Enzyme design. Structure first.
Site, PDB file in Angstrom:
ATOM      1  N   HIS A  23       0.823  -1.205   0.000  1.00 10.22           N
ATOM      2  CA  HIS A  23       0.000   0.000   0.000  1.00 10.22           C
ATOM      3  C   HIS A  23       0.860   1.260   0.000  1.00 10.22           C
ATOM      4  O   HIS A  23       0.360   2.365  -0.207  1.00 10.22           O
ATOM      5  CB  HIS A  23      -0.952   0.008   1.199  1.00 10.22           C
ATOM      6  CG  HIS A  23      -0.267   0.196   2.516  1.00 10.22           C
ATOM      7  ND1 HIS A  23       0.269  -0.852   3.232  1.00 10.22           N
ATOM      8  CD2 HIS A  23      -0.036   1.310   3.250  1.00 10.22           C
ATOM      9  CE1 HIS A  23       0.805  -0.392   4.349  1.00 10.22           C
ATOM     10  NE2 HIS A  23       0.633   0.917   4.384  1.00 10.22           N
ATOM     11  N   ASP A  33      -1.091  -7.780   1.557  1.00 12.19           N
ATOM     12  CA  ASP A  33      -0.405  -6.497   1.482  1.00 12.19           C
ATOM     13  C   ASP A  33       1.110  -6.676   1.497  1.00 12.19           C
ATOM     14  O   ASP A  33       1.781  -6.288   2.454  1.00 12.19           O
ATOM     15  CB  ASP A  33      -0.841  -5.601   2.644  1.00 12.19           C
ATOM     16  CG  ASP A  33      -0.310  -4.187   2.523  1.00 12.19           C
ATOM     17  OD1 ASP A  33       0.194  -3.829   1.439  1.00 12.19           O
ATOM     18  OD2 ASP A  33      -0.396  -3.435   3.516  1.00 12.19           O
ATOM     19  N   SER A  77       5.299   1.532   8.861  1.00 13.17           N
ATOM     20  CA  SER A  77       4.533   0.694   7.946  1.00 13.17           C
ATOM     21  C   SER A  77       5.447  -0.060   6.984  1.00 13.17           C
ATOM     22  O   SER A  77       6.405   0.501   6.455  1.00 13.17           O
ATOM     23  CB  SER A  77       3.524   1.537   7.164  1.00 13.17           C
ATOM     24  OG  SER A  77       2.754   0.730   6.290  1.00 13.17           O
TER      25      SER A  77
END
Ligand SMILES: *[C@@H]1O[C@H](CO)[C@@H](O)[C@H](O)[C@H]1NC(C)=O
Lengths: 46, 712, 46
Positions: free
Chosen positions: B472, B522, B645
Site C-alpha cells: 500500500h 499487502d 509501515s
C-alpha cells in the site's frame, strides 16, 4: 532356599492421576434407530 | 598372568579374547546385548573385572537381554499408548494431549535398533508460561510445572540409565531454557555415523557462522587426544585419522583457525600451540597428527585428563599485562577423544570452570557469552563412561556435544561424510558487533509525489536484489524514478528496477460492501538495479520455509515447511518485535502476536478502525493472511506508526532474527509526527501479513536468489 | 572397604579404580572425637 520373583524384574506402578480421559469424540458411525455408537479403547491407570 | 576363564561367559551368548587374553568381549546374537557391561578387563589379581552396571551394582551371572527402549514413566498434559513393562524393537507408541493443549513434535514414535525412539520428543503444552513447556523426554522425569521466568526444572532418569545433557534447566529471559534437552541413555544405544555427523555439524557450523564477523580467523580449535593404555592402539590410531579428516573438513570452508594438538596420558604432551605461527597452517597440524604414535605413551600409560585440559588453559591464558586485543571476540572449540575413565588428577570438570572464568562466560546476566566456548567429547575406549564424557561436553539448546559411535570404523565414516557434503552456509537474520546499528535488514523507503507526498515506509533486505515491504506504500501511478530506497544508513538513494506487487492485492476491491480499505495480501518486493555488497550494516533476514532458516532453528534438514510454522508461530502468545524510528534513531519494540486463544479478541477490535465502523462481518476484513498484535494483554505492547509501515515482524529466537510478518495497518493511529499518544485505547491493535500465507509468491519471485525454499 | 592376603597387585588395581581420587600416606596427629561424628586430623606425609 529361594523363589519368588527378582526384585529387579518388578515394574512398579506410578500413574495415579486424580483425573484423566479429558478428550473429545465425534459420533459419525452409521446411525441406526437414531442412535450412534462408538467403541473406544482406553488404557486404565494404575 | 592370564585371568582364569572360569565362570566368565554369558548366558545365551558367547565371548572372545582380545589383546592376547588381557580382555574379553561378550558376543550376543543380533537382537540382544551383553549384560551388564560390553567387555571386561583382566585385573592383575588373577580375576576379571567385576560386573558393574550403570548404577554401580554388582552382578553375578552375565545374561543376554533383548534390546528394549526407555519406558515413558512420566508424561503430563496428555496420554501415551500402548503401555508395556518393556518395549521391544519396532514397537510403536502414540501421544495425544488433552483438550486445550497443543501437541508439538512426533505423535508416533517407533523403537529403533539403536535402543532409541524415532522422531522428536512429544510435548503437550498449553502456552501459558513465559517459556514453552520443556516437556518430558522418554525415560526421564521432570520436576517442576511452573514455566515462568527464572523458574527451573530438574530431570531424573530410571535406574540403570545415564542422564545425558542437563539435569537442570532455567527459563532465561527471552523465552528460552538454559542448557540442553535431557535424554536417558543406556549401555548399548550408541549413535549411528549419521546421527553423530548430523548433530555435530549442526552444532559446529552454527558456531562458525557467527565467527565470521569480521589472516588468522578469530577461532581456536584444541584437539586433545587420549593416549592412555585403557584405549588401545586400535581405537587410538583410528581416532587420529578421524581428526585428520576433521581439519581438512574445516579447511573446505575456506577458514583457517588456530589449531592446538595435545596428546595426554600420565602427563600432557603439546605438539602444536595456538601461539605458534604454524597453528593456522592446516597442513602442518595434520603432519604433526601423523608423526604421533600410540607408543609415545607406553612407558607411562596413565590417565590424567585434568592436566590435559590445564595444558589447554595455558594456551588460552595470558601474562597480564595482556588483557589481549580481541580476547573477547575469539571463539574456542575444544575437541577431545577419551573413554572418560580418568584416575589421576581427580575431577577434570574443575578445569573447565577455570576456563569459563578466564573467558568471562556465564558471569553476566545480560551477556552469557556461551557462544564463545564449545566442548565436544567423543568416546573411543572400549569401556566409556557416558557420565563423565557428558559432564565435560557443553550443553546448548538443540545441539549435541556428547557422542558415542558403535565402533571406530563408524567414527571415521562420521568425518568422511563431512568432507564430501557442503551444507548451506547462509547468514540470514544475523547481527554484527555489537557505532550502533543492530538492524542490517532494516530498510527505509521514500516515495516522492506531487506537491509533497514523501510517502514514508520501510522494508527488509531479503536478498542481494529484493527487499520485502508493504504494498500500500506504492501505487500503479508511482514510477521507478519517484521511488528511492536507502539501506545501511547510507546517505545516497538506491535506484530500483521494478516493484512486484502480489497478484491478489486489491485495496479497492471492497468499496461495494462499503469497505474503503482492504489490506489483504499487502506485500511487495523491490528488485534493486545494483547488487548489494553485504557488510556490518547490510545483511539479509531469514524467510520462512528456507534451508537457511532450518539451520537457524537448529532443526533437522528433514524439516518440512509445516514444521517451521509450528515452531515460529505456535498456537500461543508469541513473543516478537519490530523496528521503529524515533528521533532519527532506530529502536526495537517488543510485542506479542495474538495467535493463542486471545486471537479472536484482538481481531474483533478491527471494528473500531476508520471505515470499518459499519462492517457486517468482521471476519471479512481480517483474512487468515493477518497476524494480530498489540494490546494490553498479556502486556502493553507498543504500537506501529505510519513511518513504521511495511516494517518486518521479527521473532528473536536462538540468537537469530526470523521475519514472519509485514506491518500492514493499525486500528488507532498513535503517531502524528509530534509525540506518542500515551493515552492509547485498549482496542488499539496492529495487523500484519503472515509470510506463511504468501509463500507461493515469495518462492517464485525469489527462485534465483539461492535462498533454498522448501517444496511442500 | 574390607579387611585375604591383599598382595601388591591387589592394591594397584584397587587404587587405580575410576572412583579412587586421592591416595595419601598420612600420620594421625590429633584425635578430636565427639558424639555424632569423630574428627581425625591426619597429616599427609606424601
Ligand atoms: C572487549 O574488550 C574491550 C577492552 O577494551 C572492552 O572495552 C569491551 O567491553 C569488550 N567487549 C565486550 C563484548 O564486552
Amino acid at each position: 532356599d529361594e523363589d519368588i520373583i527378582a526384585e529387579e524384574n518388578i515394574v512398579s506402578r506410578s500413574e495415579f492421576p486424580e483425573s484423566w480421559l479429558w478428550n473429545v469424540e465425534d459420533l459419525k458411525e452409521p446411525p441406526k434407530n437414531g442412535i450412534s455408537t462408538k467403541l473406544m479403547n482406553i488404557f486404565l491407570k494404575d | 598372568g592370564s585371568c582364569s576363564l572360569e565362570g566368565v561367559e554369558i548366558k545365551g551368548g558367547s565371548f572372545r579374547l582380545l589383546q592376547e587374553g588381557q580382555a574379553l568381549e561378550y558376543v550376543c546374537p543380533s537382537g540382544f546385548y551383553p549384560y551388564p557391561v560390553q567387555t571386561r578387563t583382566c585385573r592383575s589379581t588373577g580375576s576379571w573385572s567385576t560386573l558393574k552396571t550403570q548404577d554401580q551394582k554388582t552382578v553375578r551371572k552375565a545374561e543376554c537381554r533383548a534390546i528394549h527402549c526407555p519406558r515413558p514413566h512420566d508424561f503430563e498434559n496428555g496420554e501415551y499408548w500402548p503401555r508395556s513393562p518393556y518395549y521391544n524393537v519396532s514397537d510403536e507408541i502414540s501421544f495425544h494431549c488433552y483438550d486445550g493443549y497443543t501437541l508439538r513434535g512426533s505423535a508416533n514414535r517407533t523403537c529403533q535398533v539403536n535402543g532409541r525412539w524415532s522422531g522428536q520428543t512429544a510435548i503437550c503444552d498449553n502456552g501459558a508460561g513465559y517459556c514453552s513447556n520443556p516437556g518430558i523426554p522418554i525415560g526421564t522425569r521432570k520436576v517442576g510445572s511452573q514455566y515462568r521466568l527464572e523458574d527451573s526444572v530438574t530431570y531424573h532418569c530410571s535406574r540403570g540409565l545415564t542422564l545425558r545433557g542437563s539435569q537442570r534447566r532455567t527459563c532465561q529471559e527471552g523465552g528460552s531454557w538454559s542448557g540442553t534437552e535431557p535424554s536417558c541413555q543406556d549401555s548399548f544405544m550408541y549413535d549411528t555415523p549419521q546421527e553423530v555427523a548430523e548433530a555435530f555439524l549442526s552444532s559446529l557450523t552454527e558456531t562458525i557462522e557467527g565467527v565470521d564477523a569480521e589472516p588468522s580467523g578469530s577461532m581456536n580449535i584444541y584437539l586433545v587426544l587420549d593416549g592412555s593404555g585403557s584405549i588401545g592402539a586400535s581405537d587410538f590410531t583410528g581416532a587420529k585419522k578421524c581428526l585428520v579428516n576433521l581439519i581438512e573438513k574445516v579447511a573446505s570452508y575456506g577458514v583457517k583457525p588456530r589449531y592446538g594438538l595435545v596428546t595426554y596420558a600420565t602427563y600432557p604432551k603439546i605438539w602444536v600451540k595456538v601461539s605458534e605461527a604454524d597453528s593456522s597452517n592446516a597442513d602442518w597440524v595434520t603432519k604433526q597428527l601423523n608423526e604421533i604414535n600410540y607408543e609415545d605413551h607406553k612407558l607411562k600409560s596413565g590417565t590424567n585428563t585434568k592436566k590435559a585440559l590445564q595444558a589447554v588453559y595455558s594456551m588460552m591464558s595470558w601474562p597480564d599485562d595482556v588483557p589481549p586485543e580481541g580476547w573477547n571476540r575469539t571463539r574456542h572449540v575444544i575437541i577431545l577423544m577419551t573413554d572418560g575413565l580418568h584416575n589421576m588428577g581427580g575431577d577434570p570438570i574443575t578445569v573447565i570452570d577455570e576456563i569459563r572464568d578466564l573467558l568471562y562466560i556465564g558471569k553476566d546476566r545480560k551477556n552469557p557469552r556461551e557462544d564463545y566456548l564449545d566442548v565436544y567429547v567423543f568416546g573411543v575406549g572400549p569401556l566409556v563412561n557416558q557420565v563423565n564424557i557428558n559432564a565435560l561436553a557443553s550443553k546448548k539448546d538443540n545441539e549435541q556435544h556428547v557422542f558415542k559411535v558403535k565402533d571406530m570404523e563408524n567414527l571415521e565414516d562420521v568425518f568422511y561424510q563431512m568432507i564430501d557434503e557442503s551444507q548451506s552456509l547462509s547468514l540470514c537474520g544475523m547481527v554484527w558487533e555489537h557505532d550502533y546499528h543492530k538492524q542490517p535488514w532494516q530498510a527505509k523507503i521514500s516515495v516522492i509525489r506531487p506537491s509533497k507526498g514523501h510517502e514514508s515506509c520501510m522494508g527488509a533486505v531479503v536478498s542481494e536484489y529484493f527487499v520485502l515491504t508493504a504494498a500500500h506504500c506504492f501505487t500503479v501511478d508511482d514510477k521507478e524514478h519517484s521511488i528511492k530506497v536507502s539501506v545501511g544508513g547510507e546517505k545516497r538513494d538506491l535506484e530500483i528496477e521494478v516493484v512486484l506487487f502480489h497478484p491478489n492485492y486489491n485495496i479497492n476491491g471492497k468499496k461495494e460492501a462499503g469497505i474503503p480499505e482492504f489490506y489483504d495480501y499487502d506485500v511487495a518486493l523491490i528488485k534493486l538495479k545494483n547488487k548489494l555488497k553485504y557488510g556490518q550494516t547490510i545483511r539479509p533476514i531469514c524467510l520462512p520455509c528456507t534451508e537457511g532458516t532450518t539451520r537457524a532453528l537448529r532443526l533437522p534438514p528433514t524439516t518440512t515447511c509445516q514444521q517451521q510454522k509450528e515452531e515460529l508461530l505456535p498456537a500461543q502468545d508469541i513473543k516478537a518485535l519490530f523496528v521503529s524510528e524515533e528521533e532519527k534513531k532506530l529502536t526495537r519494540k517488543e510485542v506479542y502476536i495474538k495467535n493463542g486463544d486471545k486471537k479472536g479478541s484482538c481481531e474483533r477490535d478491527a471494528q473500531y478502525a476508520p471505515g470499518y465502523d459499519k462492517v457486517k462481518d468482521i471476519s471479512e476484513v481480517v483474512t487468515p493472511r493477518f497476524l494480530c498484535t498489540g494490546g494490553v494483554s498479556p502486556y502493553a505492547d507498543p504500537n506501529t506508526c505510519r513511518g513504521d509501515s511495511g516494517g518486518p515482524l521479527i521473532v528473536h529466537k536462538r540468537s537469530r532474527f526470523i521475519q514472519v510478518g509485514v506491518i500492514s495497518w493499525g486500528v488507532v493511529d498513535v503517531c502524528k509526527n509530534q509525540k506518542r499518544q500515551k493515552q492509547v485505547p485498549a482496542h488499539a491493535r496492529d495487523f500484519h501479513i503472515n509470510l506463511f500465507q504468501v509463500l507461493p509468491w515469495l518462492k517464485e519471485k525469489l527462485q534465483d536468489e539461492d535462498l533454498g525454499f522448501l517444496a511442500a | 572397604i574390607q579387611k585375604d592376603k591383599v598382595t601388591l597387585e591387589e592394591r594397584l588395581d584397587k587404587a587405580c579404580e575410576p572412583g579412587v581420587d586421592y591416595v595419601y600416606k598420612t600420620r594421625l596427629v590429633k584425635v578430636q572425637l565427639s558424639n555424632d561424628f569423630d574428627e581425625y586430623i591426619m597429616a599427609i606425609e606424601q
